[PDB]
Amino acid sequence: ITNLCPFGEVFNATRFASVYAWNRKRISNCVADYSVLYNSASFSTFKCYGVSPTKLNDLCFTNVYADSFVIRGDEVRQIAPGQTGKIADYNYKLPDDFTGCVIAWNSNNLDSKVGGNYNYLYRLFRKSNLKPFERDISTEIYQAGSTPCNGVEGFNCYFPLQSYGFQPTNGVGYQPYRVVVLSFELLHAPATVCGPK
């Protein structure tokens, strides 16, 4: 395979998804140059699990899965196995046995505008925590109280999604970060994604 993995399509997307409606890109039948990623002076975060950034280009996998979205800075720590918080519980959950890398970069200059950018949403309320890689996009009014809501917003009856309102003057923990999770799948099957041999 001379096919080069279309990382560009993911990292340089221009449009990025809200965390609640996170995107997935399947990556198969190409050679992956992880060098392009770990050499970039953009990534404030590069946490790898069951695998090492150095080791990446010398490793072979069945498939790779790139999940991408936007969150607050303070929430970058939650995109990890065995975490809790509004994001890990209600938006995007990694499993305990997760194999892959979590890469994040500050996108204040892109995803912030004066007066606040209210486009990026997250789920604030859910009846229960997400199972790993579950993706909930429903907008059922959430029953906080004892009264049934009947799909009407009001007291104790909240719309489950909230805006971030990223403004450029915020502290980093409240600035937007773009996140890409690379999942490395390893089945008892021939590998389709390898580093430069």
């Binding site: 404030s44 303070d74 502290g171 980093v172």
Partner: peptide, 8 residues
């Protein structure tokens, strides 16, 4: 700390 405009 995440108060300022940069990592801290």
């Amino acid at each position: 700390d995440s108060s300022l405009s940069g990592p801290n």
